[PDB]
């Protein structure tokens, strides 16, 4: 695109699209969730119901403060305790076809924004070092 | 603009860290509670030596059998901690900044004898950028 189109786009355009975002399931226990954060080397992901709507963020800060202990790491309680418990639910949201701007903004104070279709279909994540990238080139040149 | 890194970073004294030969108990710990998911690793001078984080804890300790979580504090940040890091310097350009923080999340500010003086992070960048657009 050219910089005069690049206000113009939408968030969909620019998106990682979920079929190459990680993700886990409300209904996971904690010690899924943590192997699928330190498998794909993310510090934290999405989290959806079984129709593919999101419900919250789960990270691995959230996971070890549920198993630091007083006296030991208590990692007897990742298989105890599920996502739905301790996952992050205030979040933002963005539309597949939302001014990018508005993507521009949210994630001044949020290191991705997680986008869904109009029926609350999960559809991607909006990232800052996409964000970044692409201002990269409309600044410079 | 004229604007430098060092009108916009984060100053040292605000930035949460660990020092070398912490152990990665320790510093997981640090993370989880400021909630922070990377921070600077520094010695007793002050010096930056590296950077740490809840992934590459994690993967350190990721094991074929189980997540070996005693051996946390058997390992120091330094043998897990990354330090091919850039660098910025406190009079460099915002524009330098704005480069290098499309791979990283933040980038360390430190003099000619590795003092550290504060991070250049994503979002003292995007804040700048919204007013420049808007
Ligand atoms: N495999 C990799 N290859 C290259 N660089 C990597 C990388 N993993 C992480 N990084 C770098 O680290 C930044 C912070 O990653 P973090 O996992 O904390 O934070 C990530 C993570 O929470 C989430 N995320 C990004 N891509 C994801 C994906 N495909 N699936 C799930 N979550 C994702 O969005 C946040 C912001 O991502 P963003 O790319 O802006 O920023 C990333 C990227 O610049
Ligand atoms: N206490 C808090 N208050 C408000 N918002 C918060 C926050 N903690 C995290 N966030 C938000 O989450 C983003 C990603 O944080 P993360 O810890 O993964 O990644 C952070 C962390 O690795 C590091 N960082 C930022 N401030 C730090 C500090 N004071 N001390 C140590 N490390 C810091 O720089 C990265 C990028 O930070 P940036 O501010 O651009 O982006 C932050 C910020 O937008």
Redesign the pocket.
């Known amino acids: 695109l050219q910089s005069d189109q690049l206000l113009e786009a939408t968030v969909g355009q620019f998106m990682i699209e979920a079929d190459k975002v990680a993700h886990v399931q409300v209904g996971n226990n904690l010690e899924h969730a943590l192997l699928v954060l330190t498998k794909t080397g993310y ?1 934290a992901i999405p989290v959806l119901d079984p129709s593919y709507r999101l419900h919250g963020l789960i990270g691995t800060n959230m996971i070890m403060n549920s198993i630091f202990g007083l006296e030991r790491i208590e990692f007897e309680k990742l298989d105890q305790i599920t996502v739905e418990e301790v996952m992050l639910t205030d979040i933002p949201r963005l539309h597949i076809n939302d001014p990018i701007m508005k993507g521009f903004g949210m994630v001044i ?3 991705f924004v997680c986008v869904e279709n109009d029926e609350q279909v999960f559809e991607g994540i909006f990232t800052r070092r996409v964000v970044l990238k692409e201002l990269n080139k409309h600044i410079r040149s």
């Open positions: 510090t104070n949020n290191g």
